Each structure stands twice: as C-alpha cells, then as structure tokens.
Design a protein that fits this description.
The structure is cut from a larger assembly and holds 4 copies of chain A. Chain A is of the alpha/beta class. In chain A, the strands form 4 sheets. An 8-stranded parallel beta barrel of chain A has the order 4-5-6-7-8-9-10-11, surrounded by 7 helices. The longest helix of chain A has 19 residues. The termini of chain A are far apart. At the A-B interface, strand 1, helix 7, helix 8, helix 10 and strand 15 of A face strand 1, helix 5, helix 6, strand 14 and strand 15 of B. One potassium ion (K) sits at the interface of chains B and A.
Chain lengths: 365, 365, 365, 50
C-alpha cells in the first residue's frame, strides 16, 4: 500500500533524474562522414549559428574580446552584467563596430558580429535593457537564478511587447516543464535550462534545490518543441560528449562556462603556481562577485590557450557523435536513442587500468 | 503518463546497460571437473580454436612474434594495419612459414599456423586485402570503429563475393541488434562486438557514444545466433572472470588487448621505472598513432613475462568457471545464468579489509 | 518486447543480489532488554550452541587451541584439514581431553568439549572421516568450494549412512535454492552457505562466479526451513551488524574468518611491523596454502588479543540488534524485516565528517 | 699519470678492472643496467671481527 520510498503520496518523489554521466548515445545506421556533418542550429527562433555554442554571461568568462572571438568562431557571446550600464553599452558598441579568415562567423544583415547582453529584473534593469537596445545588441538574456517567478515573466512580456520586432528575448534558467511552458506563454524567443548543475554552483548544497540536467532538458523540450522555441542547456558540461548528449536530448544550443574560462581570449590575467599556468574563475553569486549567503565559489582552472583550438576540439567531438549516430544535422541528432549506464559502466567509459603518460588534447588527466 | 526519467517518449532511453562488473555467474548443478573442461569454440563458421582467445589488431600488441605465439598457444592473432601493405604481407608469410611442444597449436589443412589480418575500408583497403589473400591469410577482419556504415557493409559484401570461399570475413565492431543483423545479412562469417569499453578508448567521453559490453553482447547474440554466426567480444576484458562472463553472455570468442600488451612476445621495448618493468600501450586512434581529435590515449602497462603463462592463467580461470557452472563445453557455458550485483557487491567480490602481502599470479594490485 | 537489460530471455539475468551493505534492520515493537536476549541457536538438527558463532576450517584460524577457546566461549570450532590424518585426529583428541570460569561452554553428553572436523571428497577423505569419527569428533563438515557437485552429494549420503547416528553432517558451500534442496535431500544435517564473499576469496574475480550473501542466505533458507535443516552463513562478515543481518536473513549460525584470525588463540607467530602487531591470514586456495590456478590470497590482519573479548564484543552487538528488533530469541530475530539502502545511505551509515581520535573497542578504523 | 710522475714505477688497479668482463663474478642487472660485484678483502663477506 505505501510508496516503496516512504509515505502514502506517490507524487512526493516526482521522478528519477538523469545527468550527463548516467547515459550514453546508442550507435545507429549511419551514412554520414564526420567531416561533412552540418552542425548549424537555431539559437533563437530568428538566429542560426554555425557552431551551437554560446559563452556564459560571467565576469570571468565573457567580455568584448571573448564575445568577438566566439562570434568569429561561429557561435556567439553574452556579455556579463557585473559592471555599470555605460561600460556594457560601450562593450556592445565595441563588438558591433569590429575577411576570409573566419568563414563561419555569425553576422546580421549589416555584416557585423552578433552579440548578446544579459539583464536582470527591475526598472533599473529596464533602463539597462533600453540602453543596450539603443547600443544595437541582437539578443537580450533575462538572467535570473529562478525564472518561474512572476517578475521574470512580466519582464519578458514587457521586453517582447516593447522591442520585440528588433531584438530576441531569452528567458532565465528553468528546470521543469511548467516553467518552460510559462516562459513560452510569456513570449520568450529562447528558453535557457538548468538550475544547479553549474561547476561553481552551490545551490544544490546551500538550498537543496536542483534538477539533473538531462531530465530537465527532456522536460523543457517536451514543453517547448510543439511551439518551436529553442532550448539552451546551460552549465554542467565538462567534455564534448556532454555537449553531444545535451544536443541529443533536444536542446538546440549549449552555453559553456568553465570550458571557456581558461582560454586566453577570456577576461582576467594569468596566474603562475609551481610553474603551471592557471586563470581565475568564479560564479556570479560568489562571495567576491557579490561585492549575504553565497551560492557559488571561487577557484582556478588550467590555462588552455587560444579559443579556436578549444572550439575546434568541441566541434570535432560533436561531429564524431553525429557520425556515430548517423545524424546528418542537429535536428536529426535531437532524435537519437539513449542507453542508461551504472557506476561500473561509468568507470568503464573512462580510460581504466592504464597509467596515462601523455595527455590527449580532447581528454585531460 | 510522462516517463519517470523525463519527457513523453518511452523509447528515448532505450535500455539499461550492464557491463562486466554488474553481473556474476550463478553456480549450477555440476558434474564437470575443471581439468577436463573442453574450451574449444568457433571463431568463424569454419574455424574452431582450441582456446577461445584472439589477440587485438593493435600495433603494440600483435605482430609476427605475437601471432605465432598465440597460434601455438591454441588461439590466434590478428596482424595490425598501421604499416605498408608489403610489410603486412611479409608478416603474414613469416607466420605461415614457421611439433609436440605445442599440442594445441592451431593449423590449417596443410599444417601451417593460422593467422588473420585487419583491413580498413576503401580502394587502398581493397588492394591490401587482395595482397593479403595472395599472401595466404586465413581470416580478414574488416576493422572499423562503426560497422553500421553503408560503406563497411558494402566492403564486407564485396569481400565475401570475391574471396568468400578462400578466407573468412569478420565484420567491424557493432553494439546493437540491428547492426549485427545488418552484418549477418551482408554475409559476415563472424560479428565483432564492442564500441567504447576499450581500456585506452575515449569514445564515450569525446563523443559520448558507447554501450556496456554485456548488453551489447546479448543483443548481438540475439541477432546472430539463429543464423549460426559466431560473436567475438572485443574490449573491456581485464580478468579471466570477464572472459567467462563474456562467453556466458553468448559470445563465442574474446579478443584481448591490454592483457597481452605486457607480454614478451608483444612488440615494443621494455621500460624500467623505479625498479619496475613496464611496456608502452597505445590505442590505434591516439594522437601518437594517428601520425586531430584523437579517440585514444597512450600509457604503460606492467610487464607480465611470457605469453604462455598468461594464456594458461586465463584458461585456468575459464576452466574454473566452467566447472562451477557445470558446463562441459563452451556451448553449454553460453546458457549459464546471471545475477545482477550492486556496488557493495562489487567491493565484496574483490578481496576486502585484508593487507595482501604477496601478489597472486592471477590477481594484481 | 526485449528485456530491458538486453536479449530476449527474461531469465538470463535471474535476479538482483543484495549483500550485507545493501540492507539495514528495521526497528520494531520491543519489550526485550539486550541483557535478557537469548542468543542460543541450532548448529545442526541435534546440536544447540549458546553463541551462534563458529570458527572457520582454515589453517591460519582454527586449531586445537582455537577450538578449545571457541567451545569454552559458547560456540564451536572446526579443525582444518591441511595436514595429515593422524595429526588431525591428534588435534581432535587434544580438544576432547581438555570449572566455573566458562559457564557457557558447549559440552556433549559426557561433559567433554564439542569440536568439528573438515573432510574432503574421495577415498582418502573417507579414511580421514573414519579416523576422525574413531577419535570422537561430533560434527563432520564436507568442506568443498562447490557443493552442488554429484561427488559431494554422494560423500554426504555415504557419511550419513555410515556414522549418521554418531555424528552430524554439514554440507559444503552452496549459493542457490536448488543446491540447498539437493544437499537437504542427500541427508545433510546442516547447510553451509556462501560462494565468493570471503575476505580472502578471489573466485568472483578469477572465475567470475559468485552470489551476494544476503540473497544466497534467503534462497538457501527458503529451501531448507520447511525441513528444519539449519543454515550456516560462511564468509563476508566484518562487524557484529553483519552477524545480526545474516541471522535475520534466516541463517541459524555464522562462521567467522578474519574476525578470529588476528586473535591470540589462532595459530601462527605474531609479526611486528612499524611498532604494531599483525598475524598471517591466508585463503585455503592461495598458492602459499596449496603447497594450479589460485582462488585466494595471503595477507596480515591486525592483532586483536584474547578470543573472549572479541566474542563478547560480537555478542554485545548481536544483543543490541535483538533489543532493537524486539526479538526475544534468535528464531524471532529470523523474522525481522529489512530496508534497502543506496550508496549515499551506505556512507551515511558509517561515521562521517568527524576526525576520530581514539578507536572504539568494537568499531575499527 | 700523476702516480707515475710522483716516482712510482707501477700502478695497481682495483675498481677500474672489477667491472670488466674478465673479472670473476656473475653479471647483475638493475633497472636494465649492468653491474658487477666489488668488495674489499676485509669486508664482512670476504672474512667468511671489525
Ligand atoms: O555563482 C553562481 N551560482 C550559480 N550558478 C551560477 C553562478 N555563476 C554562474 N552560474 C551559472 O552556472 C553556469 C556554469 O557553467 P559551467 O561552468 O559550464 O557549468 C553558468 O553558465 C551560469 O548559468
Ligand atoms: O584508439 C582506439 N580507440 C578505440 N578503440 C580502440 C583503439 N585502439 C584499439 N581499440 C579497440 O579497443 C580494444 C581494447 O581492448 P582492451 O585493451 O582489452 O580493452 C582493442 O582490442 C580494439 O578493438
Ligand atoms: O582460498 C580460499 N578461497 C575461497 N574461499 C575460501 C578460501 N579459504 C577459505 N575460504 C572460505 O571463505 C571464508 C572467508 O571468511 P571471512 O574471511 O570471514 O570472509 C572462510 O571461512 C572459508 O569458508
Ligand atoms: O678490505 C680492504 N680494505 C682495505 N684495503 C683493501 C681491501 N681490499 C683491498 N684493499 C686494497 O685497496 C685497493 C683498492 O683499489 P681501488 O679499488 O683501485 O681503490 C686494493 O687493490 C688493495 O690493495
Ligand atoms: K573506455
Ligand atoms: K571476495
């Protein structure tokens, strides 16, 4: 009679959550060469990228240099809002103002690099949004930790009613089906997914609130796909296989954090420790970033070098996944099968019982 | 109505995958003494080996010396293809040219040692295949990472059409029932199973594509057994118990990698570090081997000595398993029962809370 | 249509196995003080012990001194058979020949201590059994690794017909319901359960054959309880909680290995290393003991002191469990219920986030 | 050369010749390198007592 996990209510424990490490992609009938796979994906309803990657709107990840590098690499960049409005407008103008070196670069009709800007909620946020629209940004990301709030939905509706025909609107982070449906009703052009899985996040420990990324993406897609609203998986990605898994679950774009923190094109200066090169990386809710219960931490990540090499490694991993699953395009990769694995399967997936003597470019010891 | 793991599609997560560490063999009513067990099994539809083990077609594992030693021990070796065609034909001839020391040695109708050769897919691959068939090879392995490709199936069909009655053709690695069925339709005499579980493989991390080995073997056997096509489990084997589990899942032969890399007959030079002996071991998709998005790593494995001792230890483990399950032959072992175990059972299986003071021959720290 | 774990046969993976670390005992309505709990249980159909613990028939655990100490403490000992027949008969006589100090001591009708002896399978085993019976042993354990063999059943039946009215017969190790039923029908007076879980056993690694101990005990009890044949859980016990769980699963007696190997009454010289004390402990299938594929290891265990202290600690833990479950007797403990835990619950069970400064007498680091 | 210059007519060699192939003793292997045993006539082993 009672639920096997306790109590009398079968809906107290709603579901079982899968993360990236819980699943693998099943090989299928393939006629696709990895080098001929088209990796174009809809970032929003009206924007298409050549490489479905986006830089995180974090103070140690994305600024004008990183935004330019990402737009040239074929993706896009979202500028962080941990700075005054005038400076952010200057960054937007700098990005918009900047031949054959980058065939995959993302540009508008006026031939200038695309860029995105992150805004909060409030009348101050309204002023910032209007200033950034005047500065000519292409997409505004309403950035909130919990986007199922009434205020966030009202802000999204206001922005769409005001500057809808000019810029695109991307909703704050969600983790359920109802939240995604509410964001789509409000009129958001894209839905960003993830609450907890950030590499520097401590929401699941401090507050005990979170959701595994694969299940959250599946639910959000089940809510957004009938209306054609793209999904951006945000946070939790460590390898290119994770990107492939996120895209195969239904997410149209992936937003990268610590994978782009150690690049040269990122803000922040180099740090030397025992002859090794590291760079700082902190969450936007960290104790320093707030300058109060922090919801993030501070740390250092190894230096990685030029952004082009990292983006090419990630794209190569995605192309290999597409070749394995027989996916000509991302839209076909979004219908690939999944297989769940156990902890033993997890340690079988990684290299095992071998003393790695030299690092691979796409896999770090 | 919604799937407990998210979404509305019940087939999005196809199945739960079991690896070697997830299962154990159930003891059964036995009348078999381990010393009198018959370990012979079919490699292809026409070749039967006295010991159901095959060396991997890797440049650090199998060459003429290892192939000759494996053929003498009762198994077989497969020469790799990371070298020019003329040299590979020379290795084939060297093996074929080379009485009571090895009663279990595998020989053809002329009394010459059996040996196999690995080829790719393409026109140069076809030239290599014709050269090797002229050189006198016994089995040709169409060795590809993803064998459900239309080109690989066409290559297998061409090889069977041309030289089908002289040599046998073994298909590339598959991981699903559909791929094994496609290979069987294409005319393959044996199906090789496994995508990901290699000790040096990084496909499941770089691309996020893979499948646990026990489930893959079960599915491929379900596809192949009604048509009498043998199955060769490739990758992931670390102990003799793993070999017994693979053969119990339905596989007719096991292909060994890192277990044969530390032997004397394997190519490579001995390495001394801090009083200990190792040998290099690299995957055929590693950056060192491809000369880029590599799909392998490089490392070192401890030195284990002569091949015959290792083969005897593995065969003793297999005979112990056959005696435990009451299996007179491998075909009777292929119907043994499995019990699924958890991580706590996983640590209980290995020795626990004991300070091992001397290494056993078949269990290494 | 297909099985979720692979293939078309739902009985290929027969069941899910639970070990000691996967379950906990559920508290129930209790009117039992831990001091008034009756810990007596049946060893065989005609022999009742005051303490349901038995020493292992190993050459590093039980000899005359250990057998005498165990019989004095309220349990029993089983003399190993890795020595000539005359020496074993001498050990039996030494135990028999050997007052308020030990009021719980187990004695036969004549007032002499009880002892058990281990015999193999064969004609030499028959001669050894006859010599031991002449020497006056009370219980013969047909000690085999796999007791579902036809020879083991024949030996048990022959011994039961020969000296069944003078001694009791205990069957070798089983792990399935069918094996226990076969042993019971063969006429065994007690059934010993366990294949793999020994702390020095490598069968699950070498042969890949085994069964988790809780599930094996449950199956064997389901086979044996209707006929009133007791069950002895052998191997895998590390704490008094494990003893309580084993008895609650249906086992009537527990056989202890490494928990008694480091005591003062165990054979062997005390070994000093780094200012601390250890004693040798090796499996009967280890290469050192066999003097050929080994299925055991050698090692050292920390010195623990007199046997009486260890037995008192174990009995205190068992009495605490009996008080928690409200079990006046062991037969009432054999009906307590279990709760299945996960890995997180497993690490919650042990002490966590605390630096232990002094070792508790019953909980060891 | 220095010893002969000081006035010595002949030099007697010890460890300079111990490792040669013509010296008695079994060749020993350590870390893949080759070494040979050398001990003094007053060593504890050679005596077989300060
Ligand atoms: O301080 C923080 N707390 C919680 N989430 C954060 C914080 N800073 C950034 N995030 C989010 O977590 C993601 C981390 O990305 P990752 O490093 O790729 O996992 C970012 O892209 C943001 O969406
Ligand atoms: O670089 C590589 N990537 C992926 N698979 C590989 C690579 N090199 C070899 N393999 C396969 O993986 C297997 C590994 O076997 P193992 O060393 O026994 O785990 C080999 O026998 C090959 O079939
Ligand atoms: O070499 C061996 N291999 C396998 N089982 C063994 C061996 N020696 C003893 N055993 C059994 O395994 C048990 C181990 O007890 P434990 O150390 O308390 O787990 C012994 O009591 C025997 O029943
Ligand atoms: O045990 C010993 N103690 C002291 N001198 C020794 C001993 N054995 C040999 N010698 C002398 O020391 C010399 C060592 O030569 P060297 O190896 O060139 O230094 C020998 O040639 C002997 O003359
Ligand atoms: K792997
Ligand atoms: K064990």
């Amino acid at each position: 009679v009672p639920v096997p996990t306790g109590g009398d209510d079968p809906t107290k424990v709603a579901m079982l959550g899968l993360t990236f490490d819980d699943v693998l992609l099943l090989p299928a009938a393939s006629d696709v060469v990895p080098a001929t796979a088209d990796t174009s994906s809809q970032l929003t309803k009206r924007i298409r990228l050549r490489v479905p990657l986006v830089s995180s709107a974090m103070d140690t990840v994305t600024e004008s240099r990183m935004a330019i590098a990402m737009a040239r690499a074929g993706g896009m960049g979202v500028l962080h809002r941990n700075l005054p409005v005038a400076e952010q407008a200057g960054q937007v103008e700098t990005v918009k103002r900047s031949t054959e070196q980058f065939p995959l670069s993302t540009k508008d009709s006026d031939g200038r690099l695309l860029v995105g800007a992150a805004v909060g909620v409030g009348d101050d946020a309204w002023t910032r949004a209007m200033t950034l629209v005047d500065a000519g940004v292409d997409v505004l990301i309403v950035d909130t930790a919990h986007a199922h709030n009434r205020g966030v939905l009202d802000m999204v509706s206001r922005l769409k009613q005001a500057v809808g025909e000019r810029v695109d609107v991307v909703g704050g982070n969600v983790a359920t089906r109802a939240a995604a449906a509410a964001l789509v009703e409000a009129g958001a052009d894209a839905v960003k997914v993830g609450v907890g899985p950030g590499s520097i996040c401590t929401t699941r420990v401090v507050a005990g609130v979170g959701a595994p990324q694969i299940t959250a993406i599946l639910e959000a897609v089940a809510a957004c796909k009938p209306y054609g609203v793209p999904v951006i998986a945000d946070g939790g990605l460590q390898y290119s296989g994770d990107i492939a898994k996120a895209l195969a679950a239904g997410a149209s774009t992936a937003m990268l954090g610590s994978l782009l923190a150690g690049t040269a094109e990122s803000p922040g200066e180099l740090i030397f420790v025992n002859g090794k090169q590291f760079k700082s990386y902190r969450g936007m809710g960290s104790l320093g970033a707030m300058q109060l219960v922090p919801e993030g931490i501070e740390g250092r990540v190894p230096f990685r070098g030029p952004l082009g090499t990292v983006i090419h490694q990630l794209t190569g991993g995605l192309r290999a996944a597409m070749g394995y699953t027989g996916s000509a395009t991302i839209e076909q990769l979004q219908q690939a099968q999944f297989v769940q694995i156990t902890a033993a399967g997890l340690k079988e997936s990684h290299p095992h019982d071998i003393t790695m003597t030299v690092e691979a470019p796409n896999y770090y010891t």
